[PDB]
Amino acid sequence: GRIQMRTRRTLRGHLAKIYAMHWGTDSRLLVSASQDGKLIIWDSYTTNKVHAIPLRSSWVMTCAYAPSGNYVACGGLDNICSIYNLKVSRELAGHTGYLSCCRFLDDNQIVTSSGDTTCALWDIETGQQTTTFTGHTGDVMSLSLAPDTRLFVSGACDASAKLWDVREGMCRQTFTGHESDINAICFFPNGNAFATGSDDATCRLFDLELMTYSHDNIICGITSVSFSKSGRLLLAGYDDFNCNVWDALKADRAGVLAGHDNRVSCLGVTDDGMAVATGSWDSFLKIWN
Amino acid sequence: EKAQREANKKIEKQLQKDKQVYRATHRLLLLGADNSGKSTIVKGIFETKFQVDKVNFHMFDVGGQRDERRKWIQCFNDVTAIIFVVDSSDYNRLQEALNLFKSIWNNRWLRTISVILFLNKQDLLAEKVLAGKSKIEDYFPEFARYTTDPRVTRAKYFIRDEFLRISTASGRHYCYPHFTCAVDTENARRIFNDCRDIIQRMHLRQYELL
C-alpha cells in the first residue's frame, strides 16, 4: 500500500557530497564515501564512527566493504581500485576508465567496472585480471551481484544491460528496453530479475522489459535503485532534490522520501532490511526507519 | 563502552582537523580538448597542488578517461569553478567547443557551477587570421556582419562572444571569459580571483544579502 517513513539518525560529519556508501554483513557497520577523500566507517545504531581512514584520491565513485569486513575497496575516478587494510594493502591497476563501481565476491577477489566498456575481475593478493568483460559499447555505470556471485550485470550508457558470468567471461544476452543512459542497477533479491534506473525519467524492470514507471510531472531521471529485504518495495533515488519510492509490482507511487537538501547519490539498503540510508549531495547520510 | 566513546571522541578530533584543512582547500575541474594545452595552464588524474596567498588549490585534470564524459562530469558539481580551455585555432573543433560549453551550461547540475572560460591559443588565432588560409566567415557567416591589429582583436572577441551568447541565453552561475597562452604564468592568479568572486557570490546567497 502506501508507505511513509522519516529520518531516524543523521550521520553528519562528511565534508563533501556522499557519493557512494555500502553496508557490511552486520548492518551495524556502514562505509560512507565522499568526494572529499575520506572513508568514514560509521556505527549505525550508536552513531559512533568506529573507523575513519583517509584516501589516496579525493574522488571516490564507489566503496566496497568486504563481507568479511577486513578490507575496504575505494574505487574512484582514478584508474585504481585501492584496497585498505584494517585490523593500504594493494594497488590494483589495469583499468582504462573511471571506477564506476566495485563489489567483493569474497575476501581475496574483487569485481569492478571502468568508464571504458571493459569490466574486470581481479585477484587481490596478485592484482591480476583473471577475467575480462568487454562486450558493452557505452560507459558502464553500476554493477549488481546476486546472492550467488556467479552472475553480475553491468548497466551501460548505451541503454544496454548485459548479464555476465564470472567464469566464462562472455555475455550471453542483452537488454535494450531503455532509451537513455542507465546509471543505476540492482538485482531483485529473488530470481534473475533486476531493476534499471535511467536518465529518461523512467525506471524499468527486466527479466529473462516487463515493467515501467513514469509520470508526466517527473522530468528527471533515476540516480540510484535498490530493493527492500523481500523486494516488494523499490526505493529509487531521483535527480530532483527528494527521493521517491516506487512499487516493483505496481506502477503507482508508494510514497516519497523528502528531507534532502540536494539530489540523492546512493540509496543503500541494509542486508537485514532493518534500515535504509540515502547518501545525498548535501554531505549528510540520513537513515530512515 | 568507554573505549568506544573515547575512540569516537578522537575520531571527531581528527575529523574536525580534516574539516578545517578541507575548508582551507578549494577544488577545481580542468576541461578542454586534446589539442588545448591545459597542461601549460597547469604549469587517472593529473593532480595539481598549487597555492596562492596561503590558500590551497587542487586543480584536477581528468585525462585518463575516454570520449564519453557526460557521466563522470557529475562528480565535479561541488567544485568552486570549472577551468574550461578552448583551442580556438582549429575552427573545425571550435564548433565542438561551443557545443560542449552549451552542454555544460544547460546541464541539470552544472547550472550552479560558474565556469572559467580560457581561450588558449590567442597567439595561434592571431597568426591564423593574419595568414587567412581558412576564412572565419566560411566557418561562421555571422562574422560577415558582426561588429565590435583590429582584425585579430575582432576575431578574438567574436569567438568569445559566441560562448558568451550561449551562456547568457539561459543569473545564478556565471561564465568568466579569459584569454591565455602557453607563456602566461598568471593563470593561477586569474583562477584564484575568479574563485574568490564565486565564493563571494555564494556567501551573498548564503548570508541572505541578496
Partner: nanobody, 109 residues
Framework: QVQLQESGGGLVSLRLSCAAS????????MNWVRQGLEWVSD????????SYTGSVKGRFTISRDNNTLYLQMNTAVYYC?????????????????????RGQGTQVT
C-alpha cells in the same frame, strides 16, 4: 530495442529522412553529423531556437516532423543523431565515438 533507419543517398538536392522508433521522438532533441564526425545543426523541442554550423547556415536546411527528421542537400556519411537528455537542452556525446543513439548513415556526393 532502440533502432534507427534512414533513407536517401546517391549522386547529386536529396531527401535525408530519418526513421526513428522505440522511443518518444517528441521528448528528445536531434542533431546532424558528417564524417571528423562533426556536429551540424539542431532543432529544439518545439521546432524553434534553431542553430546551424557556420558552413551549413546558407546551403542547407532542416525540419522536424512528428518520428522523422528532414534535411535538404543544397558529401560524406550522414548519421542521424539525437541526445540522451529527455527533457533538457544539454547534449554531450553526439560527436563521441561509438555513441549508440546515432544513425547508420547515407552516402551522399
Amino acid at each position: 530495442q532502440v533502432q534507427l533507419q534512414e533513407s536517401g543517398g546517391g549522386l547529386v538536392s536529396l531527401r535525408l529522412s530519418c526513421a526513428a522508433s522505440g522511443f518518444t521522438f517528441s521528448n528528445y532533441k536531434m542533431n546532424w553529423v558528417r564524417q571528423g564526425l562533426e556536429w551540424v545543426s539542431d532543432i529544439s523541442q518545439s521546432g524553434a531556437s534553431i542553430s546551424y554550423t557556420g558552413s551549413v547556415k546558407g546551403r542547407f536546411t532542416i525540419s522536424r516532423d512528428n518520428n522523422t527528421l528532414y534535411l535538404q542537400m543544397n558529401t560524406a556519411v550522414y548519421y542521424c543523431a539525437r541526445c540522451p537528455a529527455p527533457f533538457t537542452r544539454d547534449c554531450f556525446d553526439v560527436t563521441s565515438t561509438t555513441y549508440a543513439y546515432r544513425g547508420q548513415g547515407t552516402q551522399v556526393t
